[PDB]
């Protein structure tokens, strides 16, 4: 009866639990992965796994998990949930037919491709460019990481990347700005953070909320929200003006350090304390303590940075502090992450190729005369990244041309993009909207054609390359074959690719064919790759390795500390003066903060019975004294109403103090209105549905989310089905 006593088959497999993509071993018995585990060699899991990784397999064995292709009954409105089963053949034809029509009277740029997850390579990076649409985007860019990636491209010549390059194990002093580690449960960084703590790494957390990471911190600075740049500028000021910075480091690897010293003249700990609300002594002490530890003092940059409209400034400032400490590329906090060598599968160049911009004109030069039609959000902000949230307008007004048609490859349109009413207007106006997913979420059931993807355990994917101290390559192998009528994304892409004239792209007849080519290059084949799931290559990490070779890494030959001559020029400001006092909550309201549940990924795990059973709802954090003035107590429920009147389904109130009185916090990803995901439907409040407005970062396409205010209105406890009852529905592969 127990799975482990029963015959097993293991395979080396990547976790699709989230984007960290940990290398895992999957233990299947027949057609079912009973257990998954990290493995030692893999530099991401190293034998461990976070809760999401452990529970991730049940979506594959979820009775509501999407099985057949589906097409929207003709004449029924998008939203209304009327579908009819279809054949992969019929669904795939229907999509190409429609896509082609959009392309004959509007051009291929009238098709937006949104997507996320491993297979976003096919949908967001590859298919769109092979098709000729620059309107390809992922929420991990303007709804996550854009502010820091831009900041980093301008300051260093490099990205921060998906596996942020912090040398945690040698770090001695760590400053976390909103970075919640332990709630944000990215495997390796949890491990590393924990090892740092373990070796006597003292951690400072700056956050208006006393988070998990704060629970492990030597200092908690309960910063007034949207005020971090003032604290960062004042620390910059203390390391420059008290002369604590790493002089040599700036001398040999830094351009324009002088502009920064003068800029930061008046931003004193007393100026900071006034806006920041952190006492001036504390501001000083923290900068001194970090200077005392250099180069082994790091402010690792957080991943979710859209917080407010100004965001790239805050990150730039955080990076200056790291530079001033001399930590980049030294053991202590930033090792140099090099990408592994795995040669691409040989193909003709793509109609549109990317511009990994950072300097000397990476905006719209290729967009202006260069061929056709530029990404539809081209003039909205300075940076060159595609911003998912800005290309949605074009679908409603037809402004910058028209975007009819939209693909949603594993991307939560209604939870990951703000202003859900606007996104629904935009799906209304579309000629084609396809969504490739696994569960019947609220935004999948607004599609003309739903295509059920095969899940990470039933699927091969193109390799996963991770830039790292020791770059590596990972390979996921099916643990068993797809279930029902389920197809891998490589296959769906190829099958659409053949149907829209892109055979030169997609030539290989099979993914193992594809995978054997890249393995050839490196000196192996498919079977051997399956043998050592992950492949580590030699690279570099500090500056010496670079330096002795007579080179340096960057963008232009010396990190430019103020950080970017060509923004200055035509955009207006170079330095991060925009501490820009943030608009404040109206009285009766609270700033809506949000974040992660250690056990749930974004939104997609809300139907997972193993994980929902660990955390079946979110909970609104209000200061104990506010819930008391309000008449709210421990088990009460409440509706969240934002400044624009949107109400978010009843949420449990959490009157325990670990938060300022200015704010309110809820974990992101609950509040599904998606009846077909039977155990995620009707639970918690959705932060996104309350995030009606956003402040566009004019520098890094980011949509500042923490600009929404919410007030609480007493509500009744909700009456919902029993989760155990639902969780007990047997999984039948029919």
């Amino acid at each position: 009866a127990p799975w482990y006593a029963q015959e097993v088959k293991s395979v080396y497999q990547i976790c699709e639990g989230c984007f960290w993509r940990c290398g895992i071993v999957a233990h299947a018995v027949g057609n079912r992965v009973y257990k998954v585990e990290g493995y030692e060699a893999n530099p991401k899991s190293r034998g461990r796994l976070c809760p999401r990784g452990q529970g991730a397999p049940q979506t594959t064995y979820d009775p509501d998990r999407l099985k057949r292709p589906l097409i929207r009954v003709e004449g029924s409105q998008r939203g209304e949930g009327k579908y009819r089963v279809a054949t992969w053949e019929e669904a795939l034809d229907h999509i190409a037919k429609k896509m082609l029509e959009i392309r004959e009277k509007y051009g291929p740029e009238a098709i937006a491709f949104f997507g996320h997850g491993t297979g976003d390579y096919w949908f967001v990076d590859f298919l769109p460019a092979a098709w000729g649409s620059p309107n390809a985007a992922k929420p991990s860019v303007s709804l996550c990481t854009a502010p820091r990636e831009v900041a980093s491209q301008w300051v260093f010549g490099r990205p921060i990347g998906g596996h942020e390059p912090i040398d945690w194990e040698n770090a001695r002093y760590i400053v976390l700005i909103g970075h919640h580690i332990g709630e944000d449960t990215h495997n390796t960084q949890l491990q590393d953070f924990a090892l740092a703590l373990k070796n006597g790494a003292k951690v400072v957390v700056v956050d208006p909320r006393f988070s998990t990471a704060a629970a492990k911190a030597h200092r908690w600075l309960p910063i007034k929200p949207g005020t971090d740049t003032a604290l960062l500028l004042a620390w910059i000021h203390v390391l420059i003006y008290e002369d604590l910075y790493d002089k040599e480091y700036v001398a040999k690897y830094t351009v324009g350090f002088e502009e920064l010293k003068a800029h930061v003249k008046d931003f004193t700990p007393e100026w900071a304390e006034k806006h920041t609300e952190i006492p001036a002594q504390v501001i000083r002490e923290v900068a001194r303590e970090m200077a005392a530890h250099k180069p082994r003092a790091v402010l690792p940059p957080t991943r979710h940075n859209v917080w407010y409209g100004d965001d790239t400034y805050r990150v730039m400032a955080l990076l200056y502090v790291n530079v001033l400490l001399g930590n980049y590329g030294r053991p202590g906090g930033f090792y140099i992450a090099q990408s592994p060598y795995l040669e691409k599968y040989p193909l003709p160049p793509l109609p549109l190729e990317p511009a990994a911009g950072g300097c000397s004109g990476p905006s719209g030069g290729d967009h202006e005369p260069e061929g056709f039609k530029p990404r539809a959000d081209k003039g909205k902000f300075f940076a060159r990244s595609t911003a998912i949230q800005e290309l949605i307008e074009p679908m409603i007004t037809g402004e910058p041309y028209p975007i009819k048609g939209l693909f949603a490859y594993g991307i939560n349109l209604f939870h990951s993009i703000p202003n859900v009413p606007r996104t629904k207007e935009a799906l209304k106006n579309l000629d084609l909207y396809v969504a490739i997913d696994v569960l019947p979420q609220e935004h999948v059931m607004w599609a003309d054609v739903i295509l059920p993807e095969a899940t990470y355990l039933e699927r091969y994917d193109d390799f996963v390359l991770v830039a790292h101290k020791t770059p590596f390559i990972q390979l996921r192998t099916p643990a068993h074959e797809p279930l029902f009528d389920t197809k891998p994304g490589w296959w769906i892409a190829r099958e659409l690719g053949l149907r829209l004239g892109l055979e030169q792209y997609f030539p290989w007849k099979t993914i193992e064919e594809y995978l054997e080519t890249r393995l050839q290059s490196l000196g192996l084949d498919l079977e051997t790759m399956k043998g050592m799931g992950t492949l580590v290559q030699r690279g570099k990490p500090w500056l010496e390795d670079w330096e002795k070779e007579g080179r340096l890494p960057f963008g232009t030959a010396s990190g430019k500390i103020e950080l970017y001559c060509q923004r200055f020029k035509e955009a207006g400001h170079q330095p991060l003066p925009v501490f820009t006092p943030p608009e404040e909550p109206p009285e009766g309201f609270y700033r809506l903060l949000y974040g992660r549940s250690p056990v749930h990924t974004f939104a997609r795990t809300q139907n997972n019975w193993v994980l929902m059973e660990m955390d079946p709802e979110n909970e609104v954090w209000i200061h104990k004294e506010e819930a008391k003035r309000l008449g709210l107590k421990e088990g009460d429920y409440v509706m969240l109403v934002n400044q624009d009147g949107v109400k978010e389904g009843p949420v449990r109130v959490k009157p325990t103090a670990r938060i300022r009185k200015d704010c309110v916090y809820i974990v992101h990803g609950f509040g599904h209105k998606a009846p077909l995901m039977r155990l995620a439907h009707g639970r918690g409040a959705s932060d996104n549905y309350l995030q009606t407005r956003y402040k566009l970062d004019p520098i890094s396409g980011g949509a500042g989310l923490r600009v929404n205010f919410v007030r609480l209105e007493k509500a009744e406890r909700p009456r919902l089905p029993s989760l155990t009852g639902l969780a007990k529905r047997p999984f039948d592969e029919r």
């Binding site: 976070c50 452990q54 449960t185 193993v610």
Partner: protein, 193 residues
Amino acid sequence: MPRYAMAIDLSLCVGCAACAVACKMENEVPPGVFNLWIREREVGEYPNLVVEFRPEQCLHCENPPCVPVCPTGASYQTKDGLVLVDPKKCIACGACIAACPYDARYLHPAGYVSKCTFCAHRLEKGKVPACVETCPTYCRTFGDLEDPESPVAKALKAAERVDVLRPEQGTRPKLFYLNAPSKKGLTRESEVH
């Protein structure tokens, strides 16, 4: 011959229920029940705010009240210190549930009572328990308490403080909490409101 135990460092625990989900998965624990769960409690106001994350599960008490009270002999303590259930004798009378002070046991839907097993199945084949293996923070340790080299033994030896739940029942838990966050020790509901 060994005396099996588990040590969890609370100074490192962040309450990401990884261990709880890994056990759910490894042991196929049905939906409404749990061999392992995490409790999280805050203690205190603004300038002294402590949060305790605490996984709770059979402590494999050395003096288990959950054994003598069993009518059939299904509930038994092993020579190495494991408290287990021979489902073949279990009549699901719930005596052991009444007697366990830690809400560590449940009625499995197959008609017998269940609970954390210290992954006896893995132990027997020389492996460490599922909770122990999947744990980002490396705060749990396991081993023979009698072997000075074992990871629990070491963990206990290096601990700043060691605590056990409801020590005043006299069960002698063999799941040790290291370095509790609060000065006053493990958090109790009674020290709240």
